[PDB]
A paper describes a structure:
The first step of the pathway, aldol condensation of phosphoenolpyruvate (PEP) and D-erythrose-4-phosphate (E4P) to 3-deoxy-D-arabino-heptulosonate-7-phosphate (DAHP) is catalyzed by the DAHP synthase enzyme. In B. subtilis, regulation of DAHP synthase is thought to be controlled by its N-terminal domain (BsCM_2), which has residual chorismate mutase activity. Herein, we have reported the crystal structures of the BsCM_2 domain of DAHP synthase from B. subtilis in complex with citrate and chlorogenic acid. A functional trimer has three active sites formed at the interface of two monomers. However, BsCM_2 forms an entirely helical dimeric structure with two active site clefts which are formed by the residue contributions from both monomers, as previously described.
Numbering used by the authors: 1 to 86
The structure:
Amino acid sequence: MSNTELELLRQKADELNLQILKLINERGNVVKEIGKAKEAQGVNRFDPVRERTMLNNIIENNDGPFENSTIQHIFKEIFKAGLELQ
């Protein structure tokens, strides 16, 4: 592989990193707005049926190179961060 090709692939990866960052943050703003609406609780409510449905739907759309468990784990981390935000 040439040095130019290595740089091109790594620049694509960096651009994708930044786009993922942008979408995670936009999602964060959304989930904060949703949190504003909910009723105050002793611990951050994430309805389990909605969560399990969301995860399974994400998995249904998983045609990428990662196993479904990997995708599920990453999106559980994203979700948890969101909850902390609320």
